[PDB]
Amino acid sequence: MDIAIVDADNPADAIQQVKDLRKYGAKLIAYKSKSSEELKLALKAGADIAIVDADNPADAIQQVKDLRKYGAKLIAYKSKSSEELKLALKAGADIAIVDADNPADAIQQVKDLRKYGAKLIAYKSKSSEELKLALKAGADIAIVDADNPADAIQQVKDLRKYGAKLIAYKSKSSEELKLALKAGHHHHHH
């Protein structure tokens, strides 16, 4: 199953991309912001996954509680700190996004969070080899980050071939989705 990550460079365009992805037939739509209020707007537009990215951990943990009370179906939390990710999960986050800079640290955090009881661990890399190591370590969601667009296609190909069940990547633009819809085309299941 694919997760489309909204990637527009401003909130108005990001909110429109949610609508375009939903119409195109994306099964899961993820939206990241440092603003709780912006994440509520993305959910109201039809996003499935609200990614908490606020810098201040006190503020970020309160956003999890606010989004849960609000009825967010899936709340993700992005941190370089496995201690912070544990606090986010205790506060009601569904998905811990491992963001640690050093790959050795990031893989140990996957193993730590699995043993802590994390239900859904996500891991991000430009490297197919690193995502396979993370999946083996117990990650549930593989986030493709390949720099240029041709690299991103190969990484998704690599993960499909591997049998990754939850593949996340940056979405096509609204203008691309709208052109496909104008032609009568929709997302096809893989």
Author numbering: 0 to 189
Question: How do the authors describe this structure?
Answer:
To assess whether the model could perform sequence design for de novo structures, we tested our method on a Rosetta-generated four-fold symmetric de novo TIM-barrel backbone, a (βαβα)4 topology consisting of an eight-stranded barrel surrounded by eight alpha helices. We had the model fully redesign 50 four-fold symmetric sequences for the backbone and selected 8 designs for further characterization based on ranking by the model PLL and other metrics (see “Methods” section), using no information about previously confirmed sequences. Of these 8 designs, 4 are cooperatively folded proteins, as indicated by circular dichroism (CD) wavelength scans and by the presence of clear two-state transitions in thermal melt curves.
We hypothesize that the design of Ala3 (and symmetric positions Ala49, Ala95, Ala141) reduces the hydrophobic volume in the core, possibly allowing other interactions in the crystallization conditions to dislodge the helix (further discussion in Supplementary Note 1). For F2C, the model uses an isoleucine to wedge between the long and short helices and forming a Tyr-Glu-Ser polar network that extends to coordinate the loop from the beta-sheet to the short helix; for F15C, the model has a different solution, designing phenylalanine and valine residues (F10, V14) to pack the long helix against the shorter one near the top of the barrel.
